[PDB]
Design a protein around this ligand. Sequence first.
Ligand code: DST
Ligand code: DST
Ligand code: DST
Ligand code: DST
Ligand code: MG
Ligand code: MG
Ligand code: MG
Lengths: 233, 239
Amino acid sequence: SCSLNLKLCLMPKHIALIMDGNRRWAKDKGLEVYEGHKHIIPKLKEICDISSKLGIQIITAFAFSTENWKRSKEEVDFLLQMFEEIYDEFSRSGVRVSIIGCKSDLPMTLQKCIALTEETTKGNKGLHLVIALNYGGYYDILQATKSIVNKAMNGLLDVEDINKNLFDQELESKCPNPDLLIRTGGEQRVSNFLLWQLAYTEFYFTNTLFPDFGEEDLKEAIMNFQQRHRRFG
Amino acid sequence: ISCSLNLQKLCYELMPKHIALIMDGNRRWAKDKGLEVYEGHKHIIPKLKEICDISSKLGIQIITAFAFSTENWKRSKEEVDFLLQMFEEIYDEFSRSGVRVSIIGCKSDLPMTLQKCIALTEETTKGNKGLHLVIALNYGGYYDILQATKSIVNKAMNGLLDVEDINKNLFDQELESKCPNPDLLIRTGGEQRVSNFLLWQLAYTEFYFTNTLFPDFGEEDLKEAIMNFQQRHRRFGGH
Ligand SMILES: CC(C)=CCSP(=O)(O)OP(=O)(O)O
Ligand SMILES: CC(C)=CCSP(=O)(O)OP(=O)(O)O
Ligand SMILES: CC(C)=CCSP(=O)(O)OP(=O)(O)O
Ligand SMILES: CC(C)=CCSP(=O)(O)OP(=O)(O)O
Ligand SMILES: [Mg+2]
Ligand SMILES: [Mg+2]
Ligand SMILES: [Mg+2]
């Protein structure tokens, strides 16, 4: 049953992004909380454009977590309505857009915008933006477990077949995994993002709040990443 | 094929109840002091014992320590054999302490002499009422999640559970590192990553990284990490 000693999948190919700090940013400027949230999609679009030029291929971005449901009804409804603007900002861009997470919990207004945004952009050969909306690492690992159990029940596989590669092919976020993770907002934790996929990722935390995160901030993170690899082997 | 996450569990929380520890920086430390390659490794078990003593007094209840990873097998045979022989010291160092000691990881890959020492160390200390030290030896987060998955699959095949039972609590009970999860993770050695340690369990853990190499990590360094932890604001996704 056991055996472990005897492949896992300059510039980082895949960047993961935790877009934290939006509320504090607004509250600082005497603004209402919602003003902060309004910068999310525009900023992300702007970041995709900068990254696309640098040669980055994938960005996975944390927009809403399975724990975010615990916020006030007011705040939640506002965020889930706001995410409709994903269509406007991306539908006519050069970016290919996928969503990961539990779609069925979201308003049908939002469900339709998402499906449409995916359909319209599915052909773009540029940067692939993955938006994690109603997502969690616990959820990802559990839905992969259920899917593997179903396969074993239907005679498709044996317990001896269950390995890293098999499990990887059932997760919503797949190889190649993030080379670098950037978390804005000053906190040093992963908050139930891509738990499996971050096993060997480099972590970069900045105190810069997400709405102030610009090209200069990004280029710094990448510079820091390249210094880590000079002393890594 | 049906998901639902909307109406929902976490195993967290002055003092951190559970500290996870990545012990990095041993070879650099020796090479700096002009000592032998493996001189750094010789500080592991002593330091751990010392850290348990300090932590135990402070009111900490659990320490999980990363001693050997699934990726460490790729080091030289010389270095590997030395480490695996050195882990035999676990019995001497802990057997007569007040500390309860468990090992997580794939025990069957290890030399039988090591397997026996481990089982003995576990048996002797299983009754102690003080601090629980978990030593991750031949462990990885990928391995932990996979062995839990196989166990769940076997049960479903034998009619002992169905797919609608598979949830966070179920999975927690099948993993080798269980609730309560780490409140704080300390990584010595200056690098900022988790290197396939407790992937599932670190979901809401606070991370502290220090440039201090592990052999120089002492009581003052530890109290600093704890002080840093106590400043932090944990929201767990709320406001
Ligand atoms: C809701 C999203 C997209 C990210 C988190 S930003 P937030 O609303 O959690 O803001 P604060 O962390 O409270 O500043
Ligand atoms: C606990 C283990 C596996 C090793 C000791 S730390 P190390 O050997 O990796 O030290 P360096 O990072 O090589 O200085
Ligand atoms: C992870 C543990 C237990 C010790 C260090 S093993 P390593 O020094 O090769 O680790 P990294 O690959 O540098 O993260
Ligand atoms: C970035 C997103 C959308 C979610 C994770 S950040 P959060 O503020 O919900 O997380 P914490 O409460 O700081 O753990
Ligand atoms: Mg936040
Ligand atoms: Mg090292
Ligand atoms: Mg492993």
